[PDB]
Design a binder for this molecule. Structure first.
Ligand SMILES: CC(C)(COP(=O)(O)OP(=O)(O)OC[C@H]1O[C@@H](n2cnc3c(N)ncnc32)[C@H](O)[C@@H]1OP(=O)(O)O)[C@@H](O)C(=O)NCCC(=O)NCCSC(=O)/C=C/c1ccc(O)cc1
Ligand SMILES: CC(C)(COP(=O)(O)OP(=O)(O)OC[C@H]1O[C@@H](n2cnc3c(N)ncnc32)[C@H](O)[C@@H]1OP(=O)(O)O)[C@@H](O)C(=O)NCCC(=O)NCCSC(=O)/C=C/c1ccc(O)cc1
Ligand SMILES: [Cl-]
Ligand SMILES: [Cl-]
Ligand SMILES: [Cl-]
Ligand SMILES: [Mg+2]
Ligand SMILES: [Mg+2]
Lengths: 138, 143
């Protein structure tokens, strides 16, 4: 089928945007939106700060875009930017808000994947990781 | 897993965004962007045209958001607002000959641009992803 509604690229972009909208809606009480949430999660994965370069690469953004997200998070004392190399270190308050936000984010997920078994989610996860994070550039 | 890179919602938005940016870039020679392209494609799929509400539902948008996309395509002579010959109360967005020719050019670009991401995936994996994403975007009901 050559129909748009059967096209996997269309579908991925459509469901990605549905998830993005739902997660932004769920995040409203936290003051975060998806990109600032993502920087905060990445910072909270480590004790010491995480490499800003690496954050940008993971998120598929230029480092210049991550700068403003770090400023946003620092406005609320959620991360502290430390040192040509730049690292982003989560605070105790950052870690607390990350937990509250993630429960809202999971639920926003739960709503879209209800009735879809974990075996299907696991295969989707692997496939999407192989696209976003390939072993080399073809 | 607590890791962002294991969050299926993150990965959907991450790869969805890769696809969106690649499609806008592939479309630069056509003058279209992802939404105007989608409307043009959906009009071309029908012989007589497609209803605004159908387009909106396929794109997950309110119908009010489709009017300006149709205006853009109409100003370029790529679609025409017409009336369904089988029901004149049914307004249709119909592709023109020039719209069909551009849609063929544009879909060739977008197909090739998608290949970078999807060509290497096993067919059985793609098929399962397709059907799963359809069940999320376009839920079905009782028979
Ligand atoms: C349409 C999207 C996906 C969602 O936009 P949104 O609905 O404005 O959502 P937001 O993330 O801005 O806000 C989320 C929700 O939280 C709400 N919200 C927010 N901030 C607050 C607040 N501070 N207080 C209270 N409430 C709040 C906000 O109003 C909204 O609520 P609701 O309307 O009920 O869903 C938007 O991200 C977007 O346009 N993305 C770019 C891509 C795009 O054009 N998508 C449209 C579908 S067409 C498509 O995907 C085609 C792709 C395609 C791909 C490949 C191809 O080959 C061909 C085509
Ligand atoms: C071409 C895009 C998709 C849109 O840019 P644009 O057309 O030049 O225009 P705008 O900058 O006005 O953006 C249009 C809308 O695209 C929306 N958008 C912005 N990223 C996207 C996108 N990945 N898909 C789908 N619409 C988008 C964005 O929110 C905005 O919505 P709205 O404000 O309602 O009009 C551009 O954002 C782009 O190239 N994105 C690729 C880079 C990217 O998104 N990387 C991932 C960042 S991290 C992230 O998204 C995390 C999400 C997340 C989700 C769930 C979780 O559980 C956890 C995390
Ligand atoms: Cl954005
Ligand atoms: Cl940004
Ligand atoms: Cl219209
Ligand atoms: Mg919006
Ligand atoms: Mg600010």
């Amino acid at each position: 089928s050559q129909a748009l509604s059967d096209d996997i690229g269309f579908l991925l972009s459509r469901v990605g945007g549905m998830v993005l909208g739902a997660v932004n809606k769920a995040l409203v009480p936290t003051g975060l939106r998806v990109r600032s949430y993502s920087v905060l999660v990445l910072a909270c994965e480590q004790a010491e700060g995480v490499n800003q370069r690496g954050v940008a690469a993971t998120m598929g953004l230029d480092p210049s875009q991550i700068v403003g997200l770090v400023d946003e998070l620092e406005e609320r004392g959620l991360v502290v930017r430390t040192l040509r190399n730049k690292l982003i270190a989560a605070t105790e308050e950052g870690r607390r808000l990350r937990d509250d936000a993630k429960a809202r984010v999971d639920a926003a997920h739960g709503r879209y994947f209800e009735g879809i078994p974990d075996t299907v989610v696991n295969q989707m996860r692997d496939t999407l990781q192989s696209i976003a994070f390939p072993t080399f550039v073809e």
